[PDB]
Design a protein around this ligand. Structure first.
Ligand SMILES: CC(=O)N[C@H]1[C@H]([C@H](O)[C@H](O)CO)O[C@@](OC[C@H]2O[C@@H](O[C@H]3[C@H](O)[C@@H](O)[C@H](O)O[C@@H]3CO)[C@H](O)[C@@H](O)[C@H]2O)(C(=O)O)C[C@@H]1O
Ligand SMILES: CC(=O)N[C@H]1[C@H]([C@H](O)[C@H](O)CO)O[C@@](OC[C@H]2O[C@@H](O[C@H]3[C@H](O)[C@@H](O)[C@H](O)O[C@@H]3CO)[C@H](O)[C@@H](O)[C@H]2O)(C(=O)O)C[C@@H]1O
Ligand SMILES: CC(=O)N[C@H]1[C@H]([C@H](O)[C@H](O)CO)O[C@@](O)(C(=O)O)C[C@@H]1O
Lengths: 289, 291, 295
């Protein structure tokens, strides 16, 4: 009576002695009841009770809720802003970016453009299209030396004919071709009687020195009839005595089938049986393709 | 003799009618006969390993000095994905390249006058034509020498006039004209004229009579209006009083061109009295003015 | 029971229970406390722990955290604003380039490699072809922007002032002449004026000494024929020469041609045409032409 004879859990009595039942998590510390916190799991008895512990840089409490400090992601939100601000996502032709290989390259026309051995871009050097007499003269565009000067020779027959007089003669003659003119340089020669008027004929069908050809003696006026290069020449006329020199008019009259005709006329005449012709050069513009 | 023992108690203990009971707030509860800590729900707390513990995802968190902390591996992915981009990526383009740091679009600046993007999208040079100057010209597809420069033919139908020591007279003639490279050639026919002086000038009047497309200017010499002694040659002219002509060797040359009139000098070589002259054919040549 | 004192009620307790002066009390460490008259858990401050929903619970931001198998775990929606921004760059981005394109992995700059002898960057920042002057060999040349024919090849005038010499069978003598020289295309023209000389023979040589007398920009070598020093019969023509001994001249026709050029002396042949005795010659003006050598 007035004593204590029974007790409600977690108190219990045995033989006048009271003890207390504890689950895990409650324990004895010195003489006192305490919360038991095995290990280090962020819980601790500190500042007068039970508290939770968290790295101060990574976490914080807001209205007593565990929260993440925003300064956690700063290094990430920066390293990505440092890109979104400027980077290449697409490329326009001639550029092409393979979104998968992360590889960019360029579309060049191989015909016009190429890459240096030094990895540079440069224009394909193309040989220019040239028509004779324009040609590659030692590296550059120039003038074919062959157009400017070509030397040959003619060994052939010169035929005179004028109102019923006829004779031939063999001559040896230099030929020069220079730009658009040809020059036949006839030596002096002897022949027979000439008429007041007549034709002198150079037969190029035979006798030109290779690689020259009969067609190479065709005038630019082809086979028209002309009075081209009209000049005055002097011819010794005689009957075996001292020749008398007669002035005569000579010109290029017409070219036909590789035979060039020169007219020889004017000056009045004289009975004679032999003629002493001088050297005469004959020039005319030459045919081309 | 007696001992009644415990007769009173302090909180959280109390005693009523011989029975002692213990008061509990929230968070403290009876498990069986044992006092226990109450953990409602699943908030991360738990009774384990002998007592109260906190439970955390062991890949995302760890305990350092008994403080909750993020594992660095939690970020490992992020740091390598970003690093794999950092080490090599395009941030800026320099001309002719251009980066639009907004639309993330890269292209290229070109000069369309010389360069173009072809049909298939490649980069071709603009196939053009070389700047040529007459007499150089496009000869059927290539850079060549213009045919009109190499040979052009025309005609002159007009008056040659003679003048010398009071003698004056005119003759109508027609002549082929050949222009070849930088020279002109006028091909005069033999003709009949009148008395001549020892010295005198024969004049060709190109002011009219040239046949299209030739014009008077086309007969100007490269030495223009200068006085010269060009192409000096020897010509034989027949002098007569109506009888058999005597042929005098005279000296002829191109003297001067003036306002579309070409003047030739005819001089030297002796003289007789006469009233009629017989001129041979003469071809007159000189270098041509060019623009 | 012969036990002096018979205990009734509770006469002893164990820790954390204690009796003092017949009262019983319970010792409490930090973390356990009284609220009203009840045993209670003390949670100083705000560390995320709280008594609520009937007992002890932990509190976390419901956006950033969640519980799984009763474990604190990171929500996914907290990393999603990052895995997207990144996934959005991983798709389309340049990691490397091929020439003429070149990327500096350090400066993160993309440039273009160009050969500057063929390509330029105009004043607009455009890639354009450098207008290159092509290889031209005289007489082909730059004629006001175009590929044309050099005016100096088409025509040049100058002058020779020097000595003409006659030689033939003991006969010999010289004269000073002033002559024009015209160079047209591949020909040279020497326009000799009329001069007076002395005794000529049936055949002989007229020599023009070009070693001096040429007016700049001309040089002795510019008078070398295309056929160099060959002996030729070039441009043979007929000239009339007045011969006399004081009184009335007789005009003799002779044959002249260019025969040979050698060491700056052009030699003309003069022969043919019959002969008379005489001490004076009147030469006409005579023009002389031949193809000119070239480089
Ligand atoms: C988070 C933490 O520190 N957890 C420890 C825990 C708690 O402090 C108590 O459980 C709360 O009542 O104690 C543990 O050790 C119990 C023994 O501690 C011994 O000394 C310890 C002391 O408890 C620690 O706080 C201190 O940091 O280190 C000391 C080392 O001497 C006492 O001497 C002994 O009587 C016991 O009470 C436990 O298991 O409960 C260990 C936890 O790490
Ligand atoms: C994290 C967790 O399990 N939380 C539960 C919670 C805790 O286990 C206790 O608070 C620890 O003391 O208990 C809850 O259930 C209350 C009843 O539990 C009964 O014992 C259970 C116990 O819940 C389990 O944890 C244990 O493993 O099994 C025991 C046997 O059933 C008690 O016997 C009863 O008196 C109550 O305490 C609670 O709501 O508090 C359930 C929580 O989810
Ligand atoms: C997280 C939280 O709410 N903690 C509070 C607790 C609880 O109210 C009781 O301890 C539960 O019984 O304790 C205080 O009274 C205290 O010691 O100052 C206030 C403190 O802020």
């Amino acid at each position: 009576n007035q004593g204590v004879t029974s007790a409600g859990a977690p108190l219990s009595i045995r033989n006048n002695r009271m003890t207390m039942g504890l689950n895990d998590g409650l324990t004895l510390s010195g003489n006192n009841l305490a919360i038991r916190l095995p290990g280090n799991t962020g819980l601790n008895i500190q500042n007068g009770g039970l508290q939770f512990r968290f790295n101060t840089d990574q976490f914080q409490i807001v209205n007593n809720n565990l929260t993440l400090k925003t300064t956690v992601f700063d290094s990430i939100n920066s390293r990505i802003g440092a890109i979104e601000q400027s980077y290449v996502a697409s490329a326009v032709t001639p550029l092409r970016l393979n979104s998968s290989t992360k590889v960019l390259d360029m579309l060049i026309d191989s015909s016009t453009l190429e890459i240096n051995s030094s990895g540079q871009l440069t224009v394909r050097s193309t040989s220019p299209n040239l028509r004779y007499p324009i040609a590659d003269v030692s590296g550059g565009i120039g003038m074919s030396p062959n157009y400017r000067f070509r030397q040959s020779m003619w060994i052939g027959i010169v035929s005179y004919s004028g109102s019923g007089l006829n004779w031939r003669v063999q001559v040896n003659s230099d030929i020069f071709i220079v730009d658009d003119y040809i020059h036949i340089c006839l030596p002096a020669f002897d022949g027979f009687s000439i008429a007041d008027g007549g034709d002198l004929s150079l037969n190029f069908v035979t006798g030109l020195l290779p690689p020259l050809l009969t067609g190479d003696t065709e005038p630019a006026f082809h086979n028209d009839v002309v009075t081209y290069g009209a000049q005055t020449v002097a011819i010794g006329l005689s009957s075996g005595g001292t020749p008398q020199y007669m002035s005569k008019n000579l010109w290029v009259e017409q070219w036909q089938d590789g035979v060039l005709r020169l007219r020889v006329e004017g000056g009045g005449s004289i009975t004679h049986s032999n003629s002493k012709w001088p050297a005469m050069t004959v020039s005319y513009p030459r045919s081309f393709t």
